[PDB]
Amino acid sequence: CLAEGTRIFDPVTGTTHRIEDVVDGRKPIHVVAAAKDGTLHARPVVSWFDQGTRDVIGLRIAGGAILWATPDHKVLTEYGWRAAGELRKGDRVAVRDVETGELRYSVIREVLPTRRARTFDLEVEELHTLVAEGVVVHACSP
């Protein structure tokens, strides 16, 4: 799951939302989702999850964004899907390029120790992924 404060861009409206506001208000936003060939597409959120307070780790990405997620949350990388907690400085994660809107890869500059945060998840229709702080992450249903 993803930490409070995680920014989620809605490509249909152009609005960026904090994930806790999306969940707390059951907001019918779209997200940017990735398909298996690396193309990006707008897809609606269909479920909203409040996952409680948990440890989250931080992945600071080239460009300056920091993704805060539980160590078990899956991130799309140069290797395929990997748990956030298994990633190291120098690994490359899939990102949405903020100027072009297409998928590229960016290097992890730093891994940050845990902090306690409220956490959340979203289920995204069809593609089961979303862009969070610019990074392609899993958005499935357990």
Residue listed under structure tokens 């992450």: 137
Per the CB < 8 A criterion, the answer to whether 28 and 8 are in contact is no
Method: X-ray
Q: How far is CA 69 from CA 4, 6, 112, in A?
A: 9, 9, 11
In the chain, the domains with their CATH numbers are: 1-142 (2.170.16.10)
Please list the residues that pair with 95 across neighbouring strands.
Answer: 104, 135
Q: What is the Cα–Cα distance from 75 to 83, expressed in whole angstroms?
A: 6
50's tokens: 């409040």
Please list the residues that pair with 83 across neighbouring strands.
Answer: 74
Q: Calculate Rg over the CA atoms of the chain.
A: 13
DSSP-assigned letters across all residues of 86-140: G--TT-EEEEE-TTT-SEEEEEEEEEEEEEEEEEEEEEETTT-EEEETTEEEE--
Residues 6+ apart with CB under 8 A from 125: 43, 44, 45, 46
Which has the closest alpha carbon to 2: 47, 48, 60, 56? 56
Resolution of the experimentally solved model in angstroms: 1.4
Residues 6+ apart with CB under 8 A from 65: 133, 134, 135
Q: What is the Cα–Cα distance from 92 to 56, expressed in whole angstroms?
A: 19
Per the CB < 8 A criterion, the answer to whether 103 and 136 are in contact is yes
Q: Residue 142, SS3? A: coil
